[PDB]
């Protein structure tokens, strides 16, 4: 039945990266867009686009990686180090502005859900509005 | 377990129990002896010890190690239990207190006198 559409995506992504795939699809969502639209605005991916699969709405996620490395295992450093889900479907989590978390000391983003809209972290204290913490990314 | 299991069943609390039934959780309990007797110690070691059973205020009765060289505890001599286990001796989780009551201090000792109720010489 697919329990949490939102964590599946971050996993589609996560997994898609460890094998260094140029692209990976994830079923459409006017919300899921509000997530990717951010991960790209913050350069974790080259962006995306809505594609057509067997007559079904999907979202291709074009991945990004560092350069090939020097020495043992030319594995390129991951552009998406971390992408864990914080607010889960079994355990919802909502934060007030006066306590929004800071992902890995400033270098990390905490994409969350608020009334004003779907926003990052600094962009959440910009508009000084809290909401449901979707997930942390670095 | 799922957080929902936690809402329901919830995390279980330890609840520790005392290795010293001294009553009132009291740091010391007066008691008179009933019999002072030497007892040999446990597995890895051997040496006829000096111990005694002490009937307590609370109608109790316990065995407590008498530490130090030589003692003057007979039968009806009262003493102060200090509570403390001796590994050498199975089933003795109490110490007689020296320099207190009918249990005098130590004869001639100079090092660590406080740990044995021994007055500083002149």
């Amino acid at each position: 039945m697919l329990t949490d559409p939102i964590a599946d995506m971050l996993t589609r992504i996560r997994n898609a990266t460890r094998v260094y795939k140029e692209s990976t699809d994830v079923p459409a969502s006017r919300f899921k867009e509000e997530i990717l639209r951010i991960l790209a605005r913050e350069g974790f991916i080259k962006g995306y686009e809505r594609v057509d699969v067997d007559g079904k709405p999907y979202l291709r996620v074009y991945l990004k990686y560092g350069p090939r490395r020097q020495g043992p295992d030319p594995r390129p450093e991951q552009v998406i180090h971390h992408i864990r889900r914080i607010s889960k479907p079994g355990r919802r989590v909502y934060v007030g502005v006066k306590e929004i978390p800071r992902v890995r000391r400033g270098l990390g983003i905490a994409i969350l859900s608020t009334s004003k809209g779907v926003l990052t972290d600094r962009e959440a204290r910009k508009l000084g509005v809290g909401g449901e913490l979707i997930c942390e990314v670095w | 377990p799922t957080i929902n299991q936690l809402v329901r069943k919830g995390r279980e609390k330890v609840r520790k129990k005392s290795k010293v039934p001294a009553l009132k959780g009291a740091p010391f309990r007066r008691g008179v002896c009933t019999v002072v007797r030497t007892v040999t110690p446990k597995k890895p070691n051997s040496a006829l010890r000096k111990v005694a059973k002490v009937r307590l205020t609370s109608g109790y009765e316990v065995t407590a190690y008498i530490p130090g060289e030589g003692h003057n505890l007979q039968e009806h001599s009262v003493v102060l239990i200090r509570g403390g286990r001796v590994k050498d001796l199975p089933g003795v989780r109490y110490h007689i207190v020296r320099g207190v009551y009918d249990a005098a201090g130590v004869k001639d000792r100079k090092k660590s006198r406080s740990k044995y109720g021994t007055k500083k010489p002149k």
């Binding site: 079994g90 355990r91 989590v93 | 957080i3 809402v7």
Partner: protein, 99 residues
């Protein structure tokens, strides 16, 4: 202000009284989860108008009896036998617990 809760009647088997059940979801004070809890109140229905299945708004009122400290304010929507079951279904379960 006089406290008010939305709820659902689940017994008009009493003379001019009713058994109003109201759920109250709230964030657990340790595990975040929004856990619903429920309480039963008894409302003073002088006109014997409020029947079973009724969803009502009750108001903190001057005591009417031992456990009647609330009067029903106004109806919400009649036919609601669906929810009423949920409660009476849990009832039958207690039987299959003892021994």
């Amino acid at each position: 202000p006089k406290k008010v809760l939305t709820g659902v009647v689940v017994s008009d088997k009493m003379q001019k009284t009713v058994t109003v059940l109201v759920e109250r979801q709230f964030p657990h004070p340790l595990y975040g989860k929004v856990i619903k809890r429920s309480k039963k109140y008894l409302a003073h229905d002088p006109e014997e108008k409020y029947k079973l299945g009724d969803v009502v708004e009750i108001i903190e009122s001057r005591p009417i009896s031992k456990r009647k400290r609330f009067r029903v304010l106004r109806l919400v929507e009649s036919g609601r036998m669906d929810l009423v079951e949920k409660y009476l279904i849990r009832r039958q379960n207690y039987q299959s617990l003892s021994k």
